[model samples]
Target: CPSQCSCRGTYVDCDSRRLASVPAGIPTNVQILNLYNNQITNLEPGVFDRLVNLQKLYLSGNQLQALPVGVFDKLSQLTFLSLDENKLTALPNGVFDKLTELTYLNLNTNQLTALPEGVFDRLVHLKELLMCCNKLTELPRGIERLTHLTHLALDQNQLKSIPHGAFDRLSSLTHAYLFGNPWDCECRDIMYLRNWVADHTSIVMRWDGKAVNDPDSAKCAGTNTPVRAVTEASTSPSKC
Candidate 1:
């Protein structure tokens, strides 16, 4: 297990293995540990106790369903964490309170239905958050606290609505991805998204099929017009 963990400086790539449990005797000075693409299903408390100085831990593509309480307590210096492609339903409250330096978090492709309010309040340095491809029905209001975030990805989810003032404090956010959800082309909600897209032209659409928009002609015809007309009118004002 960890007994063979030989490290000179910090980085360790022990990925693509069948490690079910973390071994003991891992070097405490290690900064980056890549245990991705493993068969790890459970993590015991203090399993990463030896990695006190760890900065980046990659645990993606595993069978983990839940993280142990206080699982990240020992890695106070951790800056990046990858828990994507797992079976996590939701994270425990204060799950990330100890990692004050955390900057990047990847919770993509999980079973998360929703995040608890203030779930990420302690991550003051968080700059990028990836929660794409999940079962999230809505984003927590506390997400506005991550003022430092510059990029966010929430593609391929079940988000039916976003809270009002959800992105009010995210003035630093310059890039965002929100396509693939069941977008309602209502005048009010669709207007907000269109304004956001107009403001941030750098945003990327993960799903490319057809565009949706409503132009003046479509609005004149009626707000409840067919979706096709609204989409076509919005994208091509002259055609409408």
Candidate 2:
């Protein structure tokens, strides 16, 4: 165990230690490592390459700007990872290609403006992905392959439109957060999302995991009504 860290079985916690870098001497057999709320800004390549048994790694609330490619290539057993509350503006291509066992990934409250296409192609086992409070203007491509995903949060972004049939392939999704986005309510562009929200009564639309019976839960740009009600009541913009 690291000198100032606490270890209990396979769990190691070094959170809020006022450290600027990953402490040395973390046991290679550690399964859950908590490094949350640190001042670390950069992670050297191969820093976590030796933790073959690691499954859940928490690195939230840091000053990280970018993730190095292959940084997580060795932790194939990782299932839960959180990089939220960082300064990251972009993700490296194929950075997560090796984390095939990842089930819960959190990237909320970052400075990310975009994601690399196919960035999530290898995360077939991903069940819950939270990406709220970013600067993204569009949804990441190849997200439809996450057929096993059940919970997703995309609120508080800059998205203006969702592609047609974007959520059609997500067969297992049950709860999603679509509020706080600048959705375009034009008749043609808003058809898919508006219709999907109205039809998929089984999928909860709020972020708190509570069922929302109000049709006006998700508002559109320049409209007081929700996308579903706006479209259904013929109040959406008709630019077609």
Give the number of the best model, judged by TM-score.
Answer: 2
RMSD of each: 6.7, 2.2
TM match of model 2 to true structure:
0.92
Per-prediction TM-score, please?
Answer: 0.81, 0.92
Cα lDDT tens digits for candidate 1, 94-194: 88889999999999899999786688888999999989899887776668788999878786787644555677678887557675566555434444444
| lDDT of each candidate versus the true structure | 0.71, 0.86
lDDT of 1 at 159: 63
Cα shift from native, residue 208, model 2 (Å): 5.7
Residue 217, candidate 1: C-alpha displacement in angstroms: 22
Q: TM-score for candidate 1, please give it.
A: 0.81
Model 2 poorest 10 in a row by lDDT: 207-216
